[PDB]
Ligand binder design. Structure first.
Ligand code: FON
Ligand code: FON
Ligand code: 1W9
Ligand code: 1W9
Lengths: 442, 442
């Protein structure tokens, strides 16, 4: 007693918008540092009937029965997760149920500290995520600043983590968790030196490696698994999985943390897991361990270095003046434009990037930089030589943005008015569309 | 550089388990009250490339650009959501971003009362959900009892919500939200008298209709939109959608709640929305508005009724002595067996049901009932006449459970030893598999 017509027939209205979305993705130079492209195998898992199943609880400890094939999927995924990040299932455990990166962080923080518990994180403006305790003067913006008491450290004016201020604050504030690992941070992290500040005050070390997850798995960047109590990561960014999250916990360093994490996830926060997500993760985590994926990650860095170098060669400033990972933050001050404007200009051009704060910005509205990353374009097959073109396209957009601001003014409202019917943008979009539209596309 | 070979070659290990799970699903009589079976179109949406897109924020108000087609998809989804539940653009808003029912409830409750705020919900053992404020002696089990301050009202010894208890508590405890709408409750709800109680103490009325959502939409049961400030529903149970949830809010009654709810979801709690989920909901919400789906919902009630009557005809007792909805709770006392044991017995025969507490039960562990529900079997095409067979299978299972208890004792670990290689269970399983395996299967 069901309609089994294909999506096209059953709901043409929506099949259209989706088909449109697919073409936009196909014809864009996507520089969103947190985006990637899932392969057909992952998306078979996300669309699998395994999501009909309620599986509240953990494997071999389910509330309901008929969960034996589910138990095996969840177990394969915890296993593939632990080898992916090159840790022994005797020292580390992992929860594979958190529905997103933000849920994992909240859950793990609650587990470690509880309501009213004290936490430290990097400010959003300096590159921290919302779930790292973010708030401003007039609002507890993230639950992590409301159900917890949070304090936010900054980067120094060169755009680096000011470790000494981290300490000036950690001794003053005496938190139970210090978070590092970031949303928009162009450099590798000194986890060892985070591990020493933690000890000095008896706090847990929380590492959120969602942006750099692949670099950790492939031993290209510092391993936080050597110093951290808890490591979280989304599965959908540089990792190239579905939209989901992982919590890892060091049991050798804190036994009985396993129960704390497992129970904070369920039944404290979530109900039944999304089993199609877990299936999709298992699928990608296999791929993560394969040497063809270390190859991919290596290309992400090569492309990122090549892009940074090419951008500097055309006299564009980058925060910290380069990158160790997959992302660059462009400092636009010398051109007297905002990141807000360049985001709009690149939109008109089928280039996805987003505005970013820079250390000298005293506000998230109208910031003076943009964030770019290479994971998505690398997936599409772009090699180091193609970064020249992307750099070319960005500088060209920067100049047009300068031009249009001179013609229409510095007001965001006014500025945007210049964008439609601009001959140069239309010529540039077509270059973009023609190069993008023909790149390998999963 | 990506691997685009089918799931079958890329990861053959996982495809095997998944194909296994599919067969279990097809060869099972699924009486789990909260389960359903999605059609192929819903699952095309879940596996669509639209989940590559980061969309933090709301429609017309995104942080990133390139979000025009995602904006369209979300707006479509809100619209169908307001349509399906027969509410107006101007009286009701909806947020379609929550990832699951448990997230929607936590998010909505926080929006209404904030940290340390007061809530009243139905105790889990009486049929309320974890996120309705659940705790016990030893632990604040759900975040909804630790983030907030909660009190739990019970059903009477007859299995009905004790409105007198509800009013008496609401007056002594002075809460700001009273939740109704339940996880395991076989009767319709008197929202009118909940609305009345909420007024006497200046409290919000919160209705979680996840189990009955289709009855509310189709005008089969009492309409909570007439009285409630907030209605939540999961999209994946009787509604037959993907795993996700909806928060409805009555603006016309609480101006300024649209903002309080919308910002609770993002950026208080969630990050980027899962766009494949939103698309799938859209796809299913269209279907919900069709009168063919009203037909399906009606079959769900008819079957439920017929199953209740058939069970009674074989001298099986039901809590409240019947059902108004899609679900029955069996009271097993007259047979001196637990629901825990019957669950085990039914697992052996490819019948999914779950143990349930009855009013006389003094704890979640080793309860005296089982909950059965009809939406999944209805999806597969079973009619009123087939309920006789289901009822006969359960009666036969109840009897075998009595025998095995007599042969092996009352300890659950002992009991299970009876199950494998029992001539009767193997005969019964084969009857189940023969009849189930051949029913329509989306
Ligand atoms: N480094 C970084 N961290 C993040 O968490 C993050 C990024 N970047 N990039 C996009 C951004 C979007 N998130 C947000 C969310 C809220 C505010 C904020 O300042 N909150 C105000 C809104 C300002 C206003 O409109 O008045 C608020 O009161 O909610 C800023 C960015 N985001 C990923 O999520
Ligand atoms: N009415 C109802 N509400 C629900 O939320 C619900 C059902 N039924 N049926 C299945 C059940 C599974 N949920 C749970 C979760 C936790 C406990 C519980 O008592 N938690 C203790 C365990 C202590 C013990 O076992 O002695 C804990 O400390 O975690 C019970 C049922 N579930 C859907 O979620
Ligand atoms: C370190 C970290 N933790 C958690 C999340 C949030 O994970 P969810 O989106 O909830 O799965 C992110 C993502 N951040 C922004 C997207 O807002 C991005 O990079 O663009 C993150 O960078
Ligand atoms: C009234 C209500 N609200 C929320 C949820 C939680 O929905 P999530 O699992 O978080 O999408 C449920 C579901 N409950 C159990 C399974 O958890 C079930 O019935 O079997 C529910 O009945």
């Amino acid at each position: 007693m069901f309609n089994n017509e294909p999506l096209e027939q059953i709901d043409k209205e929506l099949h259209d918008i989706l088909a449109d979305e697919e073409k936009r993705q196909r014809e864009t130079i996507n520089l969103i540092a947190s985006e990637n492209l899932t392969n057909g195998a992952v998306r078979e898992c996300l669309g699998n009937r395994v999501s009909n199943k309620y599986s509240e609880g953990y494997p071999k400890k389910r509330y309901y029965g008929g969960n034996d094939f589910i138990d095996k999927i969840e177990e394969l995924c915890q296993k593939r997760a632990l080898e992916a990040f090159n840790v022994s299932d005797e020292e580390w455990g992992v929860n594979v149920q958190p529905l997103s990166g933000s849920a994992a962080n909240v859950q793990a923080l609650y587990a470690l500290v509880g309501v009213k518990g004290k936490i430290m994180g990097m400010h959003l403006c300096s590159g921290g995520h919302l779930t790292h305790g973010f708030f401003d003067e007039k609002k507890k913006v993230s639950i992590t600043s409301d159900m917890f008491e949070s304090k936010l450290y900054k980067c120094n004016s060169q755009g680096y983590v000011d470790l000494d201020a981290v300490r000036e604050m950690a001794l003053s504030f005496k938190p139970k968790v210090i978070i590092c690992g970031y949303t928009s941070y162009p450099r590798d992290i000194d986890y060892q030196q985070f591990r020493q500040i933690c000890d000095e005050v008896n706090a847990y070390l929380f590492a959120d490696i969602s942006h750099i997850s692949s670099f950790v798995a492939c031993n290209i960047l510092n391993n936080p698994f050597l110093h951290a109590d808890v490591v979280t990561t989304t599965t959908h960014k540089i990792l190239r999985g579905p939209r989901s999250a992982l919590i890892f916990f060091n049991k050798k360093r804190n036994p009985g943390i396993e129960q704390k994490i497992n129970s904070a996830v369920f039944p404290s926060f979530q109900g039944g897991p999304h089993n199609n997500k877990i299936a999709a993760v298992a699928c990608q985590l296999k791929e993560v361990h394969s040497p063809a994926f270390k190859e991919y990650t290596q290309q992400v860095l090569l492309n990122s270095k090549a892009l940074a170098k090419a951008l500097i060669s055309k006299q564009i400033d980058l925060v910290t003046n380069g990158t160790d990972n997959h992302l660059i933050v462009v400092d636009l001050r010398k051109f007297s434009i905002t990141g807000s404007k360049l985001q709009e200009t690149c939109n008109a051009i089928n280039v996805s990037l987003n505005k970013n704060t820079i250390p000298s910005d005293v506000d998230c509205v109208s910031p003076s930089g943009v964030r770019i990353g290479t994971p998505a374009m690398t997936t599409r097959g772009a090699k180091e030589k193609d970064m020249e073109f992307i750099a070319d396209v960005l500088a060209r957009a920067i100049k047009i943005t300068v031009d249009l601001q001179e013609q229409y003014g510095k007001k965001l409202v006014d500025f945007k008015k210049g964008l439609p019917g601009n001959a140069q943008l239309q010529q540039l979009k077509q270059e973009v569309v023609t190069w993008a539209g023909a790149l390998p596309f999963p």
